Design a binder for this molecule. Sequence first.
Ligand SMILES: [Zn+2]
Ligand SMILES: [Zn+2]
Ligand SMILES: [Zn+2]
Ligand SMILES: [Zn+2]
Lengths: 426, 426
Amino acid sequence: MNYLFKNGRYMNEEGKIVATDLLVQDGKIAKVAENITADNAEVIDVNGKLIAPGLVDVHVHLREPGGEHKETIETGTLAAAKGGFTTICAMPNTRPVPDCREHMEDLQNRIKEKAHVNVLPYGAITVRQAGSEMTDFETLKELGAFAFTDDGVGVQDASMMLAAMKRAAKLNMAVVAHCEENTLINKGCVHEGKFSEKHGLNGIPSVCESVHIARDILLAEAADCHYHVCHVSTKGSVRVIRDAKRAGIKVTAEVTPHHLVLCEDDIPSADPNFKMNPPLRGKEDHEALIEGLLDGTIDMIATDHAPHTAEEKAQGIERAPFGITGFETAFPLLYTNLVKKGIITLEQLIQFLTEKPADTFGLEAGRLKEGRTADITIIDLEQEEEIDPTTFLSKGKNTPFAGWKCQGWPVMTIVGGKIAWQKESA
Amino acid sequence: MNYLFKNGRYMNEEGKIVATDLLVQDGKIAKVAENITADNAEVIDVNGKLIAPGLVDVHVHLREPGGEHKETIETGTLAAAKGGFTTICAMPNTRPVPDCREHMEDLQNRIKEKAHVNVLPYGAITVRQAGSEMTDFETLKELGAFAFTDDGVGVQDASMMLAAMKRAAKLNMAVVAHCEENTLINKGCVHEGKFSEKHGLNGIPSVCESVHIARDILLAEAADCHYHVCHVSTKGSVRVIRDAKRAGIKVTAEVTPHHLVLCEDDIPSADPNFKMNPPLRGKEDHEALIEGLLDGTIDMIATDHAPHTAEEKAQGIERAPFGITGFETAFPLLYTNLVKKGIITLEQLIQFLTEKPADTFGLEAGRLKEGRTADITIIDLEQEEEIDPTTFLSKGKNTPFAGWKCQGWPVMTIVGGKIAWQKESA
Ligand SMILES: [Zn+2]
Ligand SMILES: [Zn+2]
Ligand SMILES: [Zn+2]
Ligand SMILES: [Zn+2]
């Protein structure tokens, strides 16, 4: 192959947007500079649009194998590419769960078979995520497992978490966690606050999350293991982590797009498209997440793509499941209400979805360096458009942003030099 | 009655030691001035000794009812007087447990019926301390409960603690907690470090204690309840509390005299007198406790008086019970190894055993003010003397400081104007 994008905008190594061109030879960034003269490659003028490295989503739910109806590896991967992602990481909460050799192989096959984008599989912590027996971290490690977690549910037994961190630490890997203390769930369907108080609905207190994060941080320090927190959502959660990094403990965390733009006060009514775990909490918590993202307490942004079908979200929020699709929303949504809003610079948004996510886990990605795989995404910052689940490539159309008008939409994604997705008029 | 202590010294309402006298009329501190005159007052020349308010110990085990052989309310309170304490708070880990009206009443009867010192009884959090059913804070509060704890055991179920604190918070009372995660005990009998390692013994990881403190802090803030930590012993525990205080949380803690003087490197061998819970940890933890007691993270000193028979302690450290005597060694042990050592001042040593405990829990004791009950104790800071369990008034002779030469021994103790104990040989 041999491409060469002309007249575009990109972020240099100093973290500043400067107009340049980009050459692609043999699925690898051949040359990055201005007026890259290469009279031997098909020209693709981006007319000043944004040229950036493929987005890195470290928290996704492809559903396959298990509920291939909610989503599929090829469909979920296609939408992902539409959102600009070139590397995603599927969670192990699928049935069967990647808790052994045979399962990790069967999953690793479906990927290299029907997956339009890079898919690093998450290794489970306990078999069938029952949390009573630890899996063979060595095997999964060999079978190219990204990291270990029981996402969807939390590791209730403390001694299991300590053991898991010791072993993971030896294998030089991370333990990702869905922090949630069951005895505190109070079987809520939203956040325990103003909203749950007005609609007479059970709410989930913040402590249900913060308590586990606090516990894991000590275990992590005791095992000297890289600990990463999933979708932070409370003021106390950010604090506990901030005190942690201040002590020099290897801890990292992420925050979802919806937890950065919406809080409880934004839920119009008992609408299932606003129900997810963790839920949208107070504005006090919202401000905390934003403050944590700006001071370093929060290391990266992850969508936590949780696709579902309308038939399921159809029933009351109490019966309805937790989860919101986010692949095709992520960037445009964040560029309009965050960057364009002033909260953060364009340079930071990109980093929070490319180099920062990659470094936290040691991945040769999220960077437009010469010699690296050609994982690129072209973005139109000018054109304004409304979010319409009708046009989503993902089977999951469960989104609360239906109608919202944004900018910064991915128009073309390149996975390994090969185009994985194109808009339809660029 | 009418006593007049002549030619003494004490801690003024500022911090320095100034020679003065003290007059007691009708069980009250009638006057605290230099050179007092009261002809009809039976004079008592303390000859330069230190005049001090009755010491306050908020963590004690009188063993009665249930373990009368280990210790009795009368043998234990007289032993407290000898140690200089006039106000003792007894833990609810006896049988029966003070978890209801009928049990609190009989225990309250025993106290006033045969206690040689003020004894404020603790109330249990859950019935029988089993941890499945919360006690009635309302009623226990009514019958005179000091605070609520399950000492000797921890509250494993997170929702129980939260509920307890929310309820305690409404009654404006404190939740005192013995921090210990059961899945992290690992059948330990000592600290999991260099010693357990050296003698092939199972150890209790530090994380077993810090994890509960970290949990409770987040719960106490949510409930907005006064949370107190018993015998802190780890580096991680001290940090967790320091972080909690900096955030304005209503949490307080304590340290025992043995944890401020010993560490695992001091344990001579498998001698049960060196076995207690929490155990004597690393020197790293020992330094953190000193730093914590100095920066204000640790608010006071509690003995954790835990008597046991010689025969029970004759068992190997594997089976032997946790606990050591502390009443009759507390002060001289701290005045010799801390004050004389320059680690802290006498002003500090006295406050950590008087006003501070009282101020934290809202008690009257701990101060030599003109109007406060005559709870006093005269201490000889010059005469040297070896600690000899053979001369203890407590049934509990289980101590690891036998033979230690010290200074600062109480020679006389006064409870409400009445002499509760005297040296018996000037
Ligand atoms: Zn999750
Ligand atoms: Zn998830
Ligand atoms: Zn205890
Ligand atoms: Zn105790």
